[PDB]
């Protein structure tokens, strides 16, 4: 009769555990779905990041180009102003010789 | 049946052992996911940072470009004028030289 008390006690514990396993499974299942979506969102980001990383010196090169092109012009100017001076000196000197 | 019934009891003691183990594994699996979720969230955030940094770097450089492009146009004009002038002086000097 006792063995029966102990036996019924156990049939409960099984029912209890089966329920708990069901919940754990379900919870784990649900998280897996989220984790799936997280993995794809990341993969998306990584793609967007590579596009931007490209755009960044596609641009930081364009900047260098221009910055060089200006320095070139400052030199070209610096030279024209030397030249013009020089031609003025010559002209002036020619005029006095008249 | 205190012989045929201890059989039933022994049967059950196994089922609990089996289930306890299973739960253990489920717990550990769950734990594992928690670790993944934390890494995911931090890696996602790290990326979002990196994206904003780049987006900034781009806009900034693209305006540095625009600055120069303006500065250059100014210089082209200044040059265009010096070139005209230079011509003009040459014409005047050449013509003066022939007259002596």
B1 Cβ under 8 Å from any chain A Cβ: no
- In chain B, the residue whose alpha carbon lies closest to the alpha carbon of A50 is B51
Report the number of distinct structural domains present in chain A. Answer: 1
Residue (of B64, B68, B65, B90) closest to A73 by Cα position: B68
d(CA A75, CA A77): 5
Maximal C-alpha separation, chain B = 145
Count CB-CB contacts under 10 A for residue B71: 16
Give the domain extent around B35: 1-100
Give the torsion through C-alpha atoms of B25, B26, B31, B32, to 10 deg: 70
Q: What is the 3-state secondary structure (H, E, C) of A42-92?
A: HHHHHHHHHHHHHHHHHHHHHHHHHHHHHHHHHHHHHHHHHHHHHHHHHHH
């Amino acid at each position: 009769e006792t063995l029966t008390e102990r036996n019924l006690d156990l049939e409960e514990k099984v029912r209890e555990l089966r329920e708990t396993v069901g919940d754990l499974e379900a919870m784990n299942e649900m998280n897996d779905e989220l984790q799936e979506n997280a993995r794809e969102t990341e993969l998306e980001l990584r793609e967007q990041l590579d596009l931007a990383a490209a755009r960044v010196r596609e641009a930081e090169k364009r900047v260098e180009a221009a910055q060089e092109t200006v320095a070139d012009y400052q030199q070209t100017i610096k030279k024209y102003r030397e030249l013009t001076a020089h031609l003025q000196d010559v002209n002036r000197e020619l005029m006095s010789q008249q």
